[PDB]
Symmetry: D3
Subunit: 263 residues, 6 copies
C-alpha cells in the first residue's frame, strides 16, 4: 500500500491529498508554500474548510469580512498554537501572503450553516498528554467539542526520543459507542529540517502493515489501522492532523497488547 505522499515541489501547492487520490471518501488536505504578496482563491463549493497557518502571516477575505495579518509564528517549532480560519461550505475566500506563508487547507464535506469564524491561538485548547517517552504537546485546533460539520483538526509536538499516536489506537470502523470511522492525514515537520521519523500503519491481523521513513513536509495517509509515530534522537517532530467521517466524534479503540501503557 502507498500511504506516503512526499512533496511534489518546493513552492505552490506542495501537497494535494483528495478523497479521489487517497482512495477514500471525506478528507482532503492541501499545503501551499507562498511568497509574500502571492494569493490563492478557495472556491464556493460543497466542502467546508479549516485554513491552518503552519508558519507566516496572511490576510483573508471571506463572506462579508476582511481579516488582516492573522497568524504569528514564523515556524511551527515556536510551539505556540497555529492561527486558523473556519470556512463553511459555499464560501469563496481569497488568502494573501503578508509574509512568506505555509498554509494548510483542511477539507471535508460541508452541509451546515455555521458562520465563517476565526480560531485564534487563544481559542485553541492546549494539553500535555502522556508521561516520559510518551510526552507530547497537543493543540486542539478544531476538536469534536467545537463546531464544524465534519472536520477534526489537531497539531502535535513529539520531542526526539518519544513515541506519539501511541499507545496504538484505531478509528476505522463504525462500532456504536466504541469507535468511529475517521480517515486521517499526517503532515510532518522536523527540527532540524533534514530529520525523519518512522511511522507504522498496521491492522491487528497485519493484512495492512506498512512502516515509513517520513521526512520534512511529507504526508502519511491513515485509511485504517493503528498508526504510531517513532521519533529519532536529534530530530524533534511536529504533525498537523485532519480527520473526518460520517459521524463527527473521535471514538477510538486501543490495541489490546499495548493498552497497559495508559495505566
Amino acid at each position: 500500500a502507498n500511504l506516503l505522499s512526499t512533496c511534489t515541489s518546493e513552492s505552490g501547492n506542495i501537497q494535494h491529498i483528495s478523497p479521489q487520490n487517497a482512495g477514500w471518501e471525506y478528507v482532503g488536505f492541501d499545503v501551499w508554500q507562498l511568497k509574500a504578496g502571492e494569493s490563492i482563491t478557495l472556491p464556493s463549493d460543497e466542502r467546508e474548510r479549516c485554513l491552518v497557518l503552519v508558519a507566516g502571516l496572511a490576510s483573508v477575505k471571506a463572506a462579508d469580512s476582511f481579516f488582516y495579518r492573522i497568524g504569528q509564528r514564523m515556524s511551527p517549532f515556536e510551539r505556540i498554537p497555529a492561527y486558523s480560519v473556519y470556512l463553511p461550505h459555499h464560501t469563496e475566500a481569497k488568502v494573501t501572503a503578508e509574509t512568506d506563508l505555509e498554509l494548510a487547507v483542511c477539507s471535508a464535506p460541508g452541509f451546515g450553516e455555521l458562520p465563517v469564524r476565526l480560531i485564534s491561538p487563544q481559542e485553541v485548547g492546549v494539553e500535555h498528554r502522556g508521561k516520559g517517552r510518551n510526552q507530547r504537546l497537543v493543540h486542539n485546533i478544531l476538536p469534536d467539542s467545537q463546531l464544524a460539520d465534519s472536520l477534526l483538526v489537531v497539531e502535535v509536538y513529539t520531542n526526539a526520543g518519544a513515541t506519539s499516536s501511541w499507545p496504538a489506537h484505531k478509528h476505522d470502523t463504525a462500532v456504536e459507542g466504541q469507535e468511529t470511522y475517521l480517515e486521517e492525514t499526517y503532515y510532518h515537520r522536523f527540527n532540524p529540517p533534514q530529520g525523519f521519523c518512522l511511522q507504522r500503519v498496521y491492522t491487528d491481523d497485519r493484512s495492512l502493515d506498512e512502516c515509513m521513513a517520513v521526512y520534512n513536509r511529507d504526508v502519511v495517509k491513515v485509511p485504517k489501522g493503528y498508526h504510531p509515530v517513532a521519533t529519532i534522537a536529534g530530530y524533534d517532530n511536529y504533525y498537523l492532523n485532519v480527520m473526518a467521517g460520517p459521524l463527527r466524534k473521535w471514538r477510538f479503540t486501543w490495541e489490546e497488547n499495548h493498552a497497559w501503557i495508559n495505566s
Copy 2:
C-alpha cells in the same frame, strides 16, 4: 493489486466496500454485525439498496411500512434462501436486530421509481448448477429477470472439494451482445468457521493475476478478469455476490481454454 479486504472488527460495520475505496464506479457492499436490540438507519440518497439477512431476524421501517421479524435462518449454512428487502433510492430505512444479526447492505446507483419490496425466500429462484466437482447451490436473490435499477445479487454454496465461479468467466468490458462491464464483490463464509478457500482473479494476458487465501467474512473485489473459487477439503464455502455496471444485464465471456468443462 489489493483485491482482498479482511474484516476490520468483530462487531458493527465489519465490512465497508465503496466505489471510492474499491477504485471503481458502481458497487458498494457493507456488512453490519449487530446484537439483538441494536439498530442502524440507512439514508435517503441517490443509491438503491438490497438488504440481505445473512443470518438472524430483523424489523425494517421504510416508506410507509413496517416489516416485523423478517428473516429465518440463523446461519447461511442452513442452505435456505436469505430474506432480503429492496429499497429504491431516496428511501430512508431503519433496521432493528430482533436477534443477533448479520446484515449485508448491497448498494449501487439509483434513479428509478420502483417501490420498496420484500424478497422472501419463496421469491428467490433456486438452481443447482454444474455436475460433480463443479456442483453448486445458487440462490438468485436479485437477478436481471427481476426489477432493480442497477443491483444484481446472488448467493452460492460450494461444498468442500468443488470449484465455483468456474469454468472461468469475465464481465469486465462492454462488448455488445457478448459481455457487460459488471463490478463484482464476494463476501465469503466457511463451515467450520476457521476454513479458507483460494480465489484467483486474473486476465487472459496475466497483467492482473492475484491468488488469495480467503477466510471467514473476508471480501474479494473483482474489478476485471476471470475469478474462480477453489474450496479446500473439510471446509464448505458460501459467498454473497453483488454486481452492478452501466447496463443491468449479466453477459459474460468464458476463458476459451476451460470452456469445454461446460460441454
Copy 3:
C-alpha cells in the same frame, strides 16, 4: 504503482480509464473498437468530450446536426491528422461506424456553453518538434489556444530510435506562472503492430519510479512526475494524449539534469 492498463478485449470498449479507476479527479479516456454498422450513444451529462477518430469513418448525430462519414485515415500511421468532434457537456451523441472504427472518447469536467464543433484535419496545428533522436511529428488536436472547458488533446509520432516526451517534463503541481497540475493519459500504437516501447514515469526524489514495456493499444496513466518514451529499433510509435486539471493551461517544468537537450 500500476500505471499500465492493457486492453481488456479485441472489440467493444477495449479501454476504459475513469477518474474513479485512475485514482484522480479530471481525465477520462475510452476507446471503442467497432465493426461497420455498429453504434454507441454518449450521454448528456456533466462531462465535455472530444471524439477522436484514431482509424476509420463515422457518422455523428449531436445537438441539431448530422455529420456524415467524417474521418479519413484507415490507420494512425498514415501520419495525417485525426478527425475529431468537440462535444460540450449536456450533449447526447450517437456515433455510427461507417467503416470498422477505432474511436477515442476523451473526457473531462464540463461547465461552459461552447457549441458542438468539428475539428477537421485542416483545423489541426501540425508541428515538427526537436532535432535528431529527439524528432517528432505533433498534431495539436485540442490545444490550450483553442476552446474547451478542460480538455487538452494531442497526438504524437515517434519514429523507431527516437525519444519523445523528452527532455523530461512534469505538470503535476500548481506553481503560479511555472507549472500546472494536469493528469495525462497515453494511448500507444505500434507499426509493425507486435512492437513495444519503454515508458518511464518518475519523480525527482524517485518515490515514484516505474518503467513499463508498452504494447499496441495499451494505456499509460501519468498521475505525476516526468514521463519520457523510449522507442525501440524497428517499431514506430504513435500516442494519443489527453490532459485536464483545474486550470486549462499547459505549463510544465523540465527536469534540470536534462534541460540542456533543449539548448
Copy 4:
C-alpha cells in the same frame, strides 16, 4: 516472495532449480525434455542423484552398471510407478533417450558409499492417503525407510477437486523428535495439459503467505511453511517432490486449526 519457477523452454533443461538459485542449502531439481536418440552426461561431483523417468524410456550407464531401455509409462497420468536410478556421489552417468523422454534429476549433498541401484516399480511403495476430497495415490520412490544419504523422493496424484499436501504440514525447523528442516520442490503436471492448480505456501504468522496459480511443468519451491495444493474441477494433478536437509527423516508438524481433518 518468488516461489514459482515456470519452464524456461519446451526442450532441453526446461527446469533448473539449484540451492544457489533457490536461496537454500540442499535440494537441486532438474528436468530434461529429450528427443529419442539424444543423451546427457551427469557429472562426477559431491551430489547424490535420483534419476526419475517421469515419461518415456531411457538407458543409463553409471559405474559398472548399464540399465537398458528402462521405464514403461509414456505419461505420468498412467498412474503406475516410475522407474528411477539412484546414483551416489562421485558417479558420472550417461542417460540416453530410447523414446522421447521426460527426465527428472533430483539432487542433494552426497557423502556415503551406497552403490548405484535401480528403483523399479517393484521397489516403489504404493499407498492411498486420505478419505474423499482428501484421497490421493502416493508412490514412495525414495522414502526415509530406503537408502540414500540425503534424498527423499515421492510422487502424488490428486484428482480434480481434491486437496493434497493437506491437512497443512510444515518441515522447516529442527525440533528434536517433532520436526525436521526439509527443503521441498513440487514439479506439477496436469491432465488435460492446459490446467492449473492453486498452491499456497504460508507460515503461522503469515509473514510468508503466497498463493500461486501453477501450470503444466511448473515448479514450486517450499523453503518453509505450510504448502497445500488445491486442484480445480476438470484438471487432474500430479506432482513429483524432492526433499533434503541436515537430517534425513520426514518429520512434520500439522497446522493446529486443520489437524481435525486427520481424525
Copy 5:
C-alpha cells in the same frame, strides 16, 4: 527486499540464518531454544563459531576442553554480560542445556588455528555509548581487538524511546582506510516481551529503503546500507549482532546529514 526473518517455532532451532538463505557470503546466525537436559552437537567444518548464552546455563564439550554449567543470567534483560565460547573451525562441540537455554550460534568462515576458549563476563568489554535519547549499554563479546578469524560479536541495550545504531552508519563497501564490507545480523528481544521496535535499512540513493516492525526473537539482516533502530515507549530493546567480511576490521562511514549528532 526481504530483510526480516521471524521465528519459525517456539522450540528447537527457532532462528536459522545462513549465507545461502541470506543471499550473502560470510555470516551465519542460529538460535536454539532448549529445555533443561536437551543437547545439540555442532559439526566439525570450515566455520568458526561463537556460542553465546543469551539466557540460561549450559555445559560445552569441545576438543580437550569441558566448560561445566557456564552462564549466569536467566534473561538478557539482567544487563550483565553473557558467557560465550569461541570455537575454531574443524571443532565438533556438544552443548547440553543445564537449565532451559537460549543459545546463539554465531558463525563465519574459519581458517586459523586459535584454540577453543571461554569468553567470560570478565573478558567482555562494557561501555556506554552516546548521550540522552542516544545512550546505550554495549557488551563487546568478540571485538576486532580480540582474536578470531572472521567473527565480530556485540550485544546492545536500548531503553524505550532511544535510538541505537545511530547516527546512521554503513559498512557495506571496501574503501581502504575508511570502510569495510561487513554483513550484519540483529537478533532482537523486548521487555515486556510483546513489544516491537522499528528498524530501517537504507542506502544514500534510497534504492534500498526498508522499514520493518521487529518483534521478540526476530532477526533483521543488513546486507548493505544504514540501519538505525528506533525503539517504542514502554518497550526496552536488546539485540545481539554478528558481523563478518573479507577483512576483520570494524570500519564504517556515517551518513553525512546526521553526523552532527556525534558532536
Copy 6:
C-alpha cells in the same frame, strides 16, 4: 525481481556482484575505483579472472609476469579497445593504479592450466553489429573463440537513440545445439555522465518482466530471459558484459516476434 545494483560508493569496491548475492552459480563482477598510487591484491582461489582496465593505467604482477603501466584510454568513451589481463585460478595478483583507475574484475569458476596473459587492443576483435537505430561498436575482449575456462567478456557502445542487445535474445537454458545457459552482467556508463537508459529483462511468458532506469556505473543482472537496452536521446551508452555457465559457448535464441529485424 531485483536485478539492478547501483554503486555503493564513489571510491573503492563500488560494484561487488557475486554468485552468492546474485542468486546464481558462476558469474562474479567487481569494479574498483582507485586513486593513482593505490593498490589491491587479488587472491589465489578457485576462480579465473579477466582484469579489464575500463579507464586509466595500471601495473599488474601475477605469477612470473609483470605488466607495467598498461592501459591507454582515460575514459571508455574514447571508443578504443581496453587493455585486459587474463588470470588463471590459483593466481594471486597485485594491481597498482599508475593513474586514477577504473578497474573491472570479471570472475568465474577456474579449473584449467592456461597461463597468465595480456589481452592488448591488438588481441581484441572489433566489429560493428547492426544497421541504423540498431548499429553498435563491439569489442570482443574474451570471446568463445579465445582461451579461458569459463569467462566470456565483451564491451558494447550504443549511441543515443539506438537499441542494443536487440533483437531480443536469451541464453538461459541448455538446449543442445541451440542455446546455452549463461548468466550475464551489464556494467553501464553514460556520456554525458548524468544520463540513463532503459533496460528490460523479460521472459516469453512475462513471469519475469522488469524494466529499470539504469544510471552511470550501475549493474544489471540477467539471470534469464530477453534483455534489450533502449538508449535515450542525448546520452551515449557503453556497457561491459561478463558471461559464464557450464558450457563456454555463446549460443542464444531470438524472441520470435522480433527476429525479422535481423533480415
